[PDB]
């Protein structure tokens, strides 16, 4: 709006939980990954109900108790589900910052010919200048 780098940024009763536990996309129930409990609770005793926030990338369900979160954030950068690659993994040191994705005339390229001691420092598009190389799962298992 004013020149920002836009990458991922945009007290009532139990009624929060039905508005979050039902997405009305397929008429099903979303179950968290750490625990296989939706924990919608009962209307008479709503204290056992747990708020669930979904991911903004892969729509992975997550309880507010499994991941150390205490509130829903809807202004600013969208919440990231912690089941993805780290953005600034630190190992003098190294600050990995990815190589992004290229949509300009398919410049990113796909050349799978080695997949051995590839040493491609990550950045793989897994299948069953800048070069996002192609990798397979057999090579990942082998190495």
């Amino acid at each position: 709006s004013r020149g920002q780098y836009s990458d991922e940024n945009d007290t009532k009763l139990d009624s929060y939980n039905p508005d979050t536990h039902i997405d009305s996309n397929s008429g099903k129930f979303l179950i968290c990954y750490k625990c296989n409990q939706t924990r919608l609770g009962s209307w008479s005793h709503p204290e056992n109900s747990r708020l669930i926030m979904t991911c903004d990338y892969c729509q992975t369900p997550w309880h507010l108790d499994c991941v150390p979160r205490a509130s829903f954030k809807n202004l600013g950068s969208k919440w990231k589900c912690p089941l993805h690659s780290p953005t600034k993994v630190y190992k003098n040191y190294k600050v990995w910052k990815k190589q992004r994705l290229i949509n300009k005339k398919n410049q990113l390229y796909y050349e799978p010919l080695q997949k051995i001691g590839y040493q491609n420092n990550g950045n793989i598009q897994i299948i069953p200048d800048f070069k996002i190389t192609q990798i397979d799962e057999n090579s990942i298992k082998y190495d």
């Binding site: 050349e111 010919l113 080695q114 051995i116």
Partner: peptide
């Protein structure tokens, strides 16, 4: 348990394996 494994990097594996 590794038993076998067989741009300009498309041919260095063959010479390394043979020699």
């Amino acid at each position: 348990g590794s038993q076998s494994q067989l741009d300009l990097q498309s041919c260095q594996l063959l010479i390394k394996q043979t020699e």
